[PDB]
Amino acid sequence: MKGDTKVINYLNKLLGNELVAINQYFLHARMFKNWGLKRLNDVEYHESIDEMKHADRYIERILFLEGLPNLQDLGKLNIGEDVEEMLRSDLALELDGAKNLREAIGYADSVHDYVSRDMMIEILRDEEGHIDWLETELDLIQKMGLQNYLQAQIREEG
Amino acid sequence: MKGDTKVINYLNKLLGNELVAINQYFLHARMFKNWGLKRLNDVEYHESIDEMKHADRYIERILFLEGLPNLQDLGKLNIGEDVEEMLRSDLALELDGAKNLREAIGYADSVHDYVSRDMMIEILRDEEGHIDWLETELDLIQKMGLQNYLQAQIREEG
Amino acid sequence: MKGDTKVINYLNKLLGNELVAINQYFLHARMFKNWGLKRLNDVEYHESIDEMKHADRYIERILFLEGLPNLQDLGKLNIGEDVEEMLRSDLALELDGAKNLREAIGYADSVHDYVSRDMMIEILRDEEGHIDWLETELDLIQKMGLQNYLQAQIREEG
Amino acid sequence: MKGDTKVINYLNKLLGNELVAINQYFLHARMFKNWGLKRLNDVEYHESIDEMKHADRYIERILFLEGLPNLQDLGKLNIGEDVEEMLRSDLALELDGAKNLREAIGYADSVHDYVSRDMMIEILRDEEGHIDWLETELDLIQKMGLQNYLQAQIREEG
Amino acid sequence: MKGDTKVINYLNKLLGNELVAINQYFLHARMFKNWGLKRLNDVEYHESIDEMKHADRYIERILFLEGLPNLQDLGKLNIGEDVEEMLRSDLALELDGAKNLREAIGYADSVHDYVSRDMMIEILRDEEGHIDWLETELDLIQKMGLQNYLQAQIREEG
Amino acid sequence: MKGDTKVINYLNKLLGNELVAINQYFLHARMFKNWGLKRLNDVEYHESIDEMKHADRYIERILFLEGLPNLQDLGKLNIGEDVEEMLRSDLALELDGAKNLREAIGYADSVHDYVSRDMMIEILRDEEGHIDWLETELDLIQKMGLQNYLQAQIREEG
Amino acid sequence: MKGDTKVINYLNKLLGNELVAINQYFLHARMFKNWGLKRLNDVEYHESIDEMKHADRYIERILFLEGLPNLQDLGKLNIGEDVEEMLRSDLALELDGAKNLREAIGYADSVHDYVSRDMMIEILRDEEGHIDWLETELDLIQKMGLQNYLQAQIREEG
Ligand code: HEM
Ligand code: HEM
Ligand code: HEM
Ligand code: HEM
């Protein structure tokens, strides 16, 4: 079904966001794993899988709408060298994507692409979830201190 | 453990190869899926997962060897517009990566990084497997003709 | 038990036939497999196993009859380069072996080696079965055409 | 994938070795069985199956590398007339094949056919295993004497 | 159904053979058992049961063909006083019966009693099996010596 | 099979390394256990078992190659009096053994003892694993502080 | 709990005995295994595990008593080149350790270290068991002769 061009541009832009997130989350995950921070590896890995699911949904939708999914261009990764810096970087990234999602959703509504909108709102709900988790972790680091926070990541949560 | 610098460069280059393959295979997969070529979607999807496993192994190894995995730079994707063109493009990609793998393996041996070598030989064996599958599909297309080949992709293989 | 010498010669000759068939069927099988003709690989492989069972029975019988099984001499393989040619070659081979079997059976009867005869008649019945299958495949190729025939070999039969 | 020609020659030569071993082990097996040496029949039979697995791997690899597997030429079998002679003959055969394998492995490495190499190293490890078993049996025959050794072969090992 | 008279004579003669074998095998069995040669008792007992099955088949066939089964006349038993002598005696007996069977089979064919023939060929195959076993035991006795052979009969084979 | 003498010397030297590691890991384990550091006892104990498996493989291989395994000479243990010191000492030991392994592997390749090489590469991969674990623990001690690190060892990991 | 110094010296001396036994039994085991003496490998291996258990108990007890377990010094191994010699050597070793154990037990009683005593008496009971087994094997070798004894080791005991 031939979709609205600008919706497809938005879908590719959102896809672009998820594909930086996929990589940034995966590197973070295995960095944590290397450091023995088993629990942060588990969560961030699962967030990488999450963003993959999102990318998949965009790709399928762009294809359905008869556009060309763009997996060639990759935005700036910001990796960071310590836990806080890396968590903070994932948070900034989620925040910029939420912003883009809010914009795309409003526009999809105005051209009547209600199913693209509906798919985007579910994705935003997952992002808003990641935002919740990242914010909480960052606050825990301040409240309990860095040493205690690290000790609490050594064992995976059952 | 501080690894050999040039081994790490090779590992990042190989990682680079897998990360273009991951995307190219995934897009191909969902293109096939959109076209209703269910079987080609199943196989190519499973090859995308495969290349992810490889990327993961490189990332973990670079990290262990104390280098910086590079997920920022992404090489040229070549997507193609029909089945043959797309299969042929995946084949050219596997062929270039096999070449890089052969080179890296020889060098790892000469600096005594036998475990990096061992990991790379297993990966090359998986690639060589994908090469086998792609070559066979491309020959089937010529032997049975394009129409018959497409009909044979409509149902997933149990 | 000391057997009739000429029966043993026949047994070795028949053994010789099975041992060329074993190899020819196995190579054909893996050629088909390489080409992705999964179904022809399954059947021809199972025919290779079949001829092995036959060879085993000859070997045991020659030994029981106190002769020397001959596994040293190997007759002409005729491999062929395409499906028809290869199928036709297996058929010619079965036909020559059936001829030898008919001759050996008649002779075993006339020297009263009824158990060798009985074993040979069961083998001939298996060969006659392979002959049936090969003839049918070759006719299917003409009736449905080569392209359709090949497409029909891509998936293994459950 | 077009392989190195000389690698293919080596693969065919190794294949040639396995195919003499297949037959020599099988005849030995059924000779032992006829003599009631149940245990030697069980082991040697299982070694025949082993060499078949090896031949299969060569055949598939030659085919993948786009060469012509050679099952037509069969090297000298040396059967022998008693246990020691026959065991010793299998040992000489394994020793010559190990020699060929060592040469092929070194050459595969130097043309970068690392997966052929990897396959060959696993095969050599199985051969080295057969060598171990044969050497041990031959020493047992001297240590316990031939009569005791034979009595020990009458019952199959659970 | 009124059978050929001479076929019935042959059937009774063969029956006569089995009925001496039944007794000779049973006595041998329980002699071995008494001597503690548990394994030879197991096998020879099972051969006695075997010959009973054969007698049964003759009896039923003679009756079907409307003749009178003869269980009154019993040929010469040759018991023997030691293992070798007794094994050798069972072997001579099987050899004479195989001779009779060969003759009967040829004659049944020439009067078209194909089912009597078919029954006789299966019996001959069982006899040929007993012949194999006896020959092997007698050769084992020479190869491993009498003392070792006896020790090997003390425990039953699982 | 008569092996290369210098390969056997290397195998004995590597065996020597594993046998110091076996003892050093076991003492460390039970020291941790005594101190109530349950988790460090579990891991180090499992590393002692690991090094035993390695010693076993060397011993068997030396024996196969017809050399004399040397379990008489035992290198310097360095025990240490606190967690860091003891972990650091295990790390120095793994590092020296990895060095020896790298040398032995290269030499085995040059005399064509590919199966010894293959066994050594698997062992090196296990060592490289222990190196990873030790390095991570030592870094955790600095990152979370000694008191927090110790508290984290009190309970065994499920 | 601060133990008696001389008890700790005894514990270390006994530990020293077990650690030579561990190695001597393990080498013997794998020597038997190499020779195909499967049964002697099974038993001696299990005795090596046994002596490890003993070493473990000493190590834990020395640590509890606040002494320093000594795994650095290793007494004279006496390996031997044939079965008898090797069995005899394990027996001499058990005999010397039993002597040391008797001495240590008496002394532990006189300084009131009743739990060390109790642990040592259980160990002595296990040693006395090994002594029983070794003595019996050595006598069996004389009673049945070396050839028969070896044949009896070829199969593992269920
Ligand atoms: C390039 C860096 C990437 C890495 C390192 C990576 C890694 C992984 C790994 C390790 C898995 C687990 C394999 C499994 O399913 O068992 C996985 C799953 C998956 N990946 Fe990726 N991935 C990457 C990018 C992508 C991309 C670009 C896509 C396409 C949008 C994608 C799609 C998927 C999907 C659909 C799954 C299955 C999720 C599930 O059901 O568990 N991945 N990935
Ligand atoms: C010419 C003398 C040979 C004899 C007497 C022989 C005999 C046998 C027998 C009795 C079996 C057991 C059947 C079964 O799988 O249940 C077997 C299995 C097999 N044979 Fe052969 N064989 C011979 C040569 C070969 C050759 C040349 C090849 C090809 C390389 C081959 C390939 C195989 C394979 C792949 C199996 C299946 C193994 C398994 O999964 O158990 N054989 N053979
Ligand atoms: C005269 C000496 C014989 C002796 C000492 C003997 C002994 C035995 C014994 C101990 C059994 C096992 C009983 C069972 O089935 O549980 C048996 C079975 C049997 N016997 Fe006899 N037998 C003799 C002759 C015969 C004869 C002349 C016939 C008739 C042809 C015969 C027919 C059978 C049959 C049909 C069985 C059953 C086999 C089975 O299913 O296990 N026996 N015999
Ligand atoms: C001398 C100090 C040693 C100590 C204190 C020690 C301790 C232990 C203990 C407690 C076990 C567990 C028993 C079990 O398997 O359930 C074990 C297992 C084992 N040990 Fe040792 N050991 C020592 C040296 C050695 C040596 C030198 C070898 C020979 C290379 C060896 C070979 C083995 C093997 C093969 C196992 C079985 C592993 C398994 O399957 O769990 N050990 N050791």
Side-chain angles (χ1 to χ4, degrees), chain C residues 13-132:
Chain C
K13 172 155 160 128
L14 299 178
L15 173 56
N17 288 341
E18 300 290 336
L19 61 225
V20 7
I22 285 163
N23 293 185
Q24 180 167 306
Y25 275 134
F26 205 88
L27 214 204
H28 283 166
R30 308 267 112 133
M31 281 173 70
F32 295 136
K33 173 146 150 96
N34 186 254
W35 292 333
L37 276 22
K38 220 105 59 68
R39 210 263 234 158
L40 256 23
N41 164 75
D42 294 349
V43 168
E44 297 250 315
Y45 175 84
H46 293 293
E47 272 158 356
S48 198
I49 295 332
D50 223 62
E51 301 311 53
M52 285 172 221
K53 297 205 215 196
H54 298 161
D56 191 14
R57 287 173 75 203
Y58 290 131
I59 287 156
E60 289 179 355
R61 183 73 187 166
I62 295 172
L63 254 7
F64 168 62
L65 292 183
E66 301 173 34
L68 268 3
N70 184 353
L71 280 85
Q72 174 67 80
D73 303 322
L74 191 62
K76 202 183 166 186
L77 258 49
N78 175 13
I79 305 307
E81 298 157 308
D82 58 59
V83 183
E84 215 198 313
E85 216 164 311
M86 39 211 278
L87 257 28
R88 232 170 246 302
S89 177
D90 292 326
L91 177 58
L93 194 61
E94 296 274 4
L95 258 18
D96 283 331
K99 204 166 283 139
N100 299 153
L101 267 161
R102 302 200 145 92
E103 180 188 333
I105 287 160
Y107 176 81
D109 192 85
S110 61
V111 292
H112 299 92
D113 191 351
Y114 297 120
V115 1
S116 296
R117 176 166 154 122
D118 187 61
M119 163 203 287
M120 293 186 291
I121 286 158
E122 293 313 284
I123 289 163
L124 178 61
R125 182 171 171 194
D126 301 338
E127 302 297 6
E128 209 121 313
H130 301 161
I131 294 169
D132 190 3

Side-chain angles (χ1 to χ4, degrees), chain E residues 100-111:
Chain E
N100 299 153
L101 266 160
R102 303 200 145 92
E103 184 177 330
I105 287 161
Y107 175 82
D109 192 84
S110 62
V111 292

